[PDB]
Structure formats: structure tokens, C-alpha cells
């Protein structure tokens, strides 16, 4: 299958309570593998997956230096953003960034990403061409001009096409046993009367990896999206994920309902029904 690497930075100001907290985490697909937290007793890039542990002292020292450098940069960026939005120094604000690379099933660079937000709203994004920018507002346009002048897009492109891909491939190899293993969902349908004339059918998917899945109910072969309650896919804590989809049906019509499950670990999509 296809794979991706992503880093997520969050920088949060907290006037009156010290310098902004900076936290960085790195993922391959849905597996976290590093963390850095400037609020740790001894801030260091640390392993969060077993296959990353074999990397040597130069790796960890390098990543730690890079992360502290980033922490400082993002403290600066929070001050700057205050100026860009005419905001006081009394409020707490958040900058976020997510970036990384996507590989196709052949191991080739599918596309790269580098996007940032301010207070939970789009701020600026590297376009798919890895050479131009999309600014969300006039403040981000200032940043865009600075980055065009410094040819930031060029350096980002060299990273995303080069180191990002090479190291993702390296991780994929080292974590072959888990990163390259899809676990199909374990699925079942439950039935609970709501009243004398209605019942809830709940279609469950458990123990699957990666998180991407599709659960839909059909009635007489027709999609019931509008009448389906879908919970957000949620992590189990053992790397796997869980999800359910529920529909309320007339008593005696249960057999007209079928749950359909699509997932990367399944050779073909599954159809299931309630089994009385």
C-alpha cells in the first residue's frame, strides 16, 4: 500500500506562565514514532515506536538540536503573528504546522505537504507544485513575500523530494513488521430494541490498522447516509482503531439492512447483516 510521513508542530503562548510551549510529533501513517516537548524536564527528541530506537546518537542529537531550534523559531513566529493581527500580549495563541511526504504503492513520491495555521485557521500552505504558496489572508501574504524572497519553497522542495522520502523509506523497511502490515477489521452487528416497533442495528469494526475505513448502512441496497449515526474513528491504545455505524429500523425489517465495510486489510469489501 501507500504510505506517508508527517510531522506536527504545535506552539502555544501563555502570557504570565512562561515562554510558549512547543511540541513536535512525527508519524508514519497512523503510527507515532517521535516526540519533542519543550515542557519536558529534559527536552529531547524521544522514540515512541520500537523500530526507531535503533537510530544512533547522531540521529537523536541532530533531531534534538533541530527541534530546539524550531521551538525558538516558533516563539518568534508567535510574537510576529501578534504584530500581523494587531493583537495584545495578554492573550494565548497557537501556531500549528503539518508537513511531510506521501509515497505511492511503488515507493515513489506521490506528493509533498507543508501547511501552517494560526489559532486553528489556515494561515499558509505550500502548493502541490512545491514552488508556490497559498496565503489565507493579508497577514499570511506578508509571510509569503518573505518566503518568496528567501526561496523557502526551494529548500522545502529539496527536503520533501529528498531526505523526507529517503528516511520514510528507511523507516518503512525498519518497521516492516508493523508499518507495512494492514490489520483488517473484526466486524459484527448488534441489535437492541428501542421500542415495540423500532430497533437499533449497530455495525462494529474493531482492531483495524490503519485508521482509514468506510462503514455504511444500506436499506434495500440503497445508502442510508442521512439516517446513519457514525462515530468518529477512535484509537484503542494498542495501535488499532475502532468505529461503529448505527441505524434505527422498523421492527421486522432488520433483514432489509446490510452493513458494508471497506478497509485496506480486506481483499474485498465486506457485507454483513444482523444474525438473530
Amino acid at each position: 500500500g501507500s504510505h506517508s510521513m508527517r510531522y506536527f508542530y504545535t506552539a502555544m503562548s501563555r502570557p504570565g506562565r512562561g515562554e510558549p510551549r512547543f511540541i513536535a510529533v512525527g508519524y508514519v501513517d497512523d503510527t507515532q514514532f517521535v516526540r519533542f516537548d519543550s515542557d519536558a524536564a529534559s527536552p529531547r527528541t524521544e522514540p515512541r515506536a520500537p523500530w526507531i530506537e535503533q537510530e544512533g546518537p547522531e540521529y537523536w542529537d541532530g533531531e534534538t538540536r533541530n527541534m530546539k531550534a524550531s521551538a525558538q523559531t516558533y516563539r518568534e513566529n508567535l510574537r510576529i503573528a501578534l504584530r500581523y493581527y494587531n493583537q495584545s500580549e495578554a492573550g494565548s495563541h497557537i501556531i500549528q504546522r503539518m508537513y511531510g511526504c506521501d509515497l505511492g504503492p511503488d515507493g515513489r513520491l506521490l506528493r509533498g505537504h507543508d501547511q501552517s495555521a494560526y489559532d486553528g485557521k489556515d494561515y499558509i500552505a505550500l502548493n502541490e507544485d512545491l514552488s508556490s504558496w497559498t496565503a489565507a489572508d493579508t497577514a499570511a501574504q506578508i509571510t509569503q513575500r518573505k518566503w518568496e524572497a528567501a526561496r523557502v519553497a526551494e529548500q522545502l522542495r529539496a527536503y520533501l523530494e529528498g531526505l523526507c522520502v529517503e528516511w520514510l523509506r528507511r523507516y518503512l523497511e525498519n518497521g516492516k513488521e508493523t508499518l507495512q502490515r494492514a490489520d483488517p477489521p473484526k466486524t459484527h452487528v448488534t441489535h437492541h430494541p428501542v421500542s415495540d416497533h423500532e430497533a437499533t442495528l449497530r455495525c462494529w469494526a474493531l482492531g483495524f490498522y490503519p485508521a482509514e475505513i468506510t462503514l455504511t448502512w444500506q436499506r434495500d441496497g440503497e445508502d442510508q447516509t442521512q439516517d446513519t449515526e457514525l462515530v468518529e474513528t477512535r484509537p484503542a491504545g494498542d495501535r488499532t482503531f475502532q468505529k461503529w455505524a448505527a441505524v434505527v429500523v422498523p421492527s421486522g425489517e432488520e433483514q432489509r439492512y446490510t452493513c458494508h465495510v471497506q478497509h485496506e486489510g480486506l481483499p474485498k469489501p465486506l457485507t454483513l447483516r444482523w444474525e438473530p
Binding site: Y7, W147, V152, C164
Partner: peptide, 9 residues
Amino acid sequence: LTVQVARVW
């Protein structure tokens, strides 16, 4: 491996 590129706003 993270990117070393500085992004000053």
C-alpha cells in the same frame, strides 16, 4: 527525519 529549513513568519 524532520526538516531543518527555518520558517520565520
